[PDB]
Amino acid sequence: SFPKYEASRLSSLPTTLDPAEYDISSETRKAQAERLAIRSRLKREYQLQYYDPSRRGVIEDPALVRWTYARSANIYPNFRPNTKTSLLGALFGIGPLVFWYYVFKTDRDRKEKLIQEGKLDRTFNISY
């Protein structure tokens, strides 16, 4: 009796239970060899100028430039006003504003009427 472990985006599937990690062929093994190839090709480019004694500065990291350039300055050029963007924009953008306008219009109007009729307790309210 070993109930299945059901994962989610907040509970990753353990590497020791993933089926793909127990069925291994030559073609699958080849990929791991080349993933480690790039993983080792970049290491030396870093370690050739990391260990240099005639260096006083920062090591430019293109992997970081691409990450931050994509996060800020490459969103609009890749935006199509489709239906997903349109509906979400209206719901997220203008949706909250409409909600709060009527929540405060109703309250103030209700609070206005009570003071008009003089049935609101304001005995000691002299700071506003």
């Binding site: 870093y46 990391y50 260096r55 006083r56 500065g57 920062v58 090591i59 990291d61 970081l64 990450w67 931050t68 996060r71 800020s72 300055a73 909250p96 504003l97 709060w100 306008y101 929540v103 405060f104 219009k105 309250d107 103030r108 609070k111 309210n125 700071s127 506003y128």
Partner: protein
């Protein structure tokens, strides 16, 4: 007000006629003397403002802003000494000339008694501001930032010019002393709904208001050190200051025309504050923080109550001495590693022990830690808005929680943690950098002893 205009002009003859290795020493010395003499404007009385002549007056709203404006010119000269070391002598002189011109227009903007003179000088602080950003920036995006900055302001200022001229013809004058005793209620009609927007829109783009705020993340990020400090300390308060004066001739229509603007600001705080948590650029994070704090200022002015106007002044002065410090602290890192990304240079509390203390004080003030003047300003606004509507506590409270997350998060990411291994040029902090932060934080804490001098005219 001629005792502060002529000396500020005389800096330019001093700057150009000085020796070639004393332009920074002379300019910094006599700017501080002008700042020292600025204290004479605290002669305010409880009933009548101080009226020097037909052109200039200084009540309690402008005295805190004049002193802050004149106290930054000495600091912006210190901050610019480094990245202008490898610069031609003549261009360095022109750079100082632009800074002195900006101070001259600002000291006159906050003192002008006529609203037309206010508009001319309120608009004249765009030429020197635009030239500093575009000429002496660093990124290619600086040119596109100057365009957004110029046209956002002018797209709203031109309608204002048509309202002030109209008001003079239909009232008789724009002198602010007269308008107190000659103002008449604004009848509710479609014609006046557009007079109201004309008078207010020109000042809600410089605050800035949420929605009309895309020029701030570009101007305050691509601008040099001197431009950013003045931009987020002295040029955002022009809109807030202008509204405090222009809403004198907009009652009772201000009661029902402020709903679309309060809601934008109340929900603009949460939105912009949330955007801080997920920023990769350290300068940008400090740029969005300004929008969040100024949204309290806009709501404070609209609700038109004594407790909002008092806190509104405090939030403007306190924010100026906090944002300016944060930019200077963020720039100290940028003058060593040469990359604005926040996650690149981590663990700096093990290499720069004293500089990790200024971050803390600046960060502590940003999150409104009592009893600093940031808290007094924010507390008062949170009291006035509660009377306006009880439910406002839900929105105002959420901002305080989020504001603590991104202020301390910035502290943790850059300072705490494990230092970067391949960053091997983190030189010890200079005296110049340390003196720059001290002049930001020491004034910001002494005011807590005597806060009455930053609470505006209602006090």
């Amino acid at each position: 007000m001629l005792k502060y205009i002529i000396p500020t002009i005389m800096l330019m003859p001093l700057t150009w006629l000085s020796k070639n290795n004393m332009i920074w020493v002379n300019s910094t010395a006599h700017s501080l003397l002008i700042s020292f003499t600025s204290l004479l404007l605290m002669n305010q009385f409880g009933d009548n403002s101080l009226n020097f002549s037909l052109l200039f007056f200084s009540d309690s709203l402008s005295t805190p802003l004049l002193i802050l404006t004149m106290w930054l010119l000495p600091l912006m000269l210190m901050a610019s000494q480094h990245h202008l070391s490898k610069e031609n002598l003549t261009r360095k002189k022109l750079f100082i000339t632009m800074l002195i011109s900006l101070q001259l227009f600002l000291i006159m903007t906050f003192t002008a008694m006529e609203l037309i003179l206010f508009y001319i000088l309120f608009e004249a602080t765009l030429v020197p501001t635009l030239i500093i950003i575009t000429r002496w920036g660093n990124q290619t995006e600086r040119l596109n930032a100057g365009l957004y900055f110029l046209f956002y302001t002018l797209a709203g200022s031109l309608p204002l010019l048509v309202a002030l001229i109209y008001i003079q013809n239909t009232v008789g004058s724009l002198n602010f002393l007269m308008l107190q005793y000659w103002v008449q209620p604004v009848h509710n009609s479609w014609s006046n709904v557009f007079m109201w927007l004309a008078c207010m829109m020109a000042f809600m783009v410089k605050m800035p208001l949420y929605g009309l705020h895309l020029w701030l993340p570009k101007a305050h990020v691509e601008a040099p050190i001197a431009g950013s400090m003045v931009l987020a300390a002295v040029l955002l308060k022009l809109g807030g200051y202008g509204m405090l004066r222009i809403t004198l001739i907009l009652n009772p229509m201000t009661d029902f025309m402020a709903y679309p603007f309060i809601m934008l600001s109340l929900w603009g705080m949460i939105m912009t504050s949330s955007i801080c948590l997920r920023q990769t650029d350290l300068k940008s994070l400090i740029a969005y923080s300004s929008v969040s704090h100024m949204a309290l200022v806009i709501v404070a002015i609209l609700i038109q109550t004594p407790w909002s106007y008092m806190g509104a002044t405090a939030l403007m002065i306190a924010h100026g001495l906090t944002s300016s410090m944060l930019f200077c602290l963020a720039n100290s890192n940028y003058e060593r590693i040469h990359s604005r990304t926040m996650i690149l240079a981590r663990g700096l509390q093990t290499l720069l022990p004293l500089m990790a203390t200024w971050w803390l004080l600046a960060s502590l003030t940003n999150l409104a830690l009592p009893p600093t003047i940031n808290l007094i300003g924010e507390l008062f606004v949170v009291m006035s808005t509660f009377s306006w509507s009880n439910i406002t506590i839900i929105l105002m409270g959420v901002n305080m929680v989020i504001t603590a997350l991104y202020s301390l998060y910035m502290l943790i990411m850059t300072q705490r943690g494990k230092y970067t291994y391949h960053i091997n040029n983190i030189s010890p902090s200079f005296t110049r950098e340390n003196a720059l932060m001290s002049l930001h934080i020491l004034p910001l804490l002494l005011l807590t002893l005597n806060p009455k001098i930053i609470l505006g005219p209602l006090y």
